[PDB]
Design a protein around this ligand. Sequence first.
Ligand SMILES: O/N=C1\CCc2cc(-c3cn(C4CCNCC4)nc3-c3ccncc3)ccc21
Ligand SMILES: O/N=C1\CCc2cc(-c3cn(C4CCNCC4)nc3-c3ccncc3)ccc21
Lengths: 264, 264
Amino acid sequence: YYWEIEASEVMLSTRIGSGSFGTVYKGKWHGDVAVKILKVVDPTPEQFQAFRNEVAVLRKTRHVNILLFMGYMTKDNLAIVTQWCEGSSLYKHLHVQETKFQMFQLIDIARQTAQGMDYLHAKNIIHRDMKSNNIFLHEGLTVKIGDFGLATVPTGSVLWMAPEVIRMQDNNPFSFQSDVYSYGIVLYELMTGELPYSHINNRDQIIFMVGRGYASPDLSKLYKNCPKAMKRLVADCVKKVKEERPLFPQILSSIELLQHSLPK
Amino acid sequence: YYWEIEASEVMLSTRIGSGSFGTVYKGKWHGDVAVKILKVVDPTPEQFQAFRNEVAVLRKTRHVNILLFMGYMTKDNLAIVTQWCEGSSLYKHLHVQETKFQMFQLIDIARQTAQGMDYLHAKNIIHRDMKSNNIFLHEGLTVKIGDFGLATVPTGSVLWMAPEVIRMQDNNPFSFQSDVYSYGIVLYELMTGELPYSHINNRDQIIFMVGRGYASPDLSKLYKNCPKAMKRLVADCVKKVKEERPLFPQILSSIELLQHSLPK
Ligand SMILES: O/N=C1\CCc2cc(-c3cn(C4CCNCC4)nc3-c3ccncc3)ccc21
Ligand SMILES: O/N=C1\CCc2cc(-c3cn(C4CCNCC4)nc3-c3ccncc3)ccc21
């Protein structure tokens, strides 16, 4: 049942960026595949396990909303192969290239986001990292979550960070709801078309700010065609207090009912 | 890990049809899912092994062109769950609903169903059964290959059967080329929009005639839009003789080649 590709069957084309312990390419294997490579010479004992970690988590993910893991390879550097997806990251669509997504399916993006998030959590999986960078879009039609570099059972990306986790507490800040906050940011991003804490400029300050209970996100700005129960859902999820947040086995269920209403 | 879905987590709506040793349903499990159930009250020891062999096959196919196997269920009927695809099987689109697919992408359907078929051949998988009834189409894009109920290491769907296999010879007629042959009929189906030998009506005479190499499929039927290189490929795959047929690694790259000579 080895999901390792027999030596050198993979091709690798140009770089597309970076991420969590690697680099990404538009390589070939039985078709088009997205591939993460080490890009290092020798493997660290901690990196060894960081690789072997992401493998065992992705091996658990057979789902139509989770980036389909296809194979791995320790020979010729450490590598992770998934399905290639035509289109771009949700971050690009929203902030880099400014795509005016229509509400009808602007919520359908959030649907599929939770569709997969529910699957992960119910199957023990934590995402930790999250972001809307990791919401890779298939054809502008199917949502797939990728890069499980920080998942379980020194640079960062402060924004999709639960205050509790920003503080640093007890070796175990990351939890179910710690994903749900980061997801709440994604909902917000869709509803606003821009990043949280936009009009400032001090990354270092934000860390302390939200991580102490000051810089709550500005709900009062968002596209006016937003549902009345959506603000309610963005609010419930982005809530500062930990256990006060709602779990995914009720997030999407509260969404797929509101998807019925706005059509008119 | 064990793709066993804990009993009663699944849900099952109206029927979709039959085939492959059960009954097909649109269901729910972290979202929409295609479900093949047993329906039988007491499971057969010959079926028991037919089920488990099917699941052992699906356990090795993480591909964008193979119907993403999601899980199974032994408790409360024997069941298999896989990704739902809004939009129908090709057999319908082509012979039942008669959708007017343009050549630009008619070959793009063919490229994918080879893209997929190559992967299995390479990863040890023989399909045995290979219908246009099995080629499930994701809306208008993404070709994903159907169930493996037969696929290995009373109702027969003749038409997509290599002469050698219609005959029966040595308990071992099903092979690589066998899959390739039936794929060629799928090519014929695409290029004609018609079933093979559609202008007779004696199933139990086609069986003999093709089985003894008298009833060759009519190549002089394909549309005018069809490429000259394509008609060559169909013929090479619809070769009566076993060893004369070309293997998938070759087929795929041969179609890839010709696909970017069409645009004009
Ligand atoms: O294991 N790590 C992996 C596996 C697949 C994978 C893909 C990416 C990835 C990075 N980008 C770009 C987009 C442009 N701006 C900079 C980032 N796009 C993708 C991508 C992924 C899947 N399908 C299509 C595209 C990153 C990491 C990993
Ligand atoms: O494991 N084998 C499986 C699992 C699910 C599964 C579904 C089908 C299947 C049979 N049909 C009909 C439809 C009416 N016309 C004749 C064919 N439609 C589907 C179908 C495919 C994908 N998504 C939803 C439904 C076949 C096999 C298997």
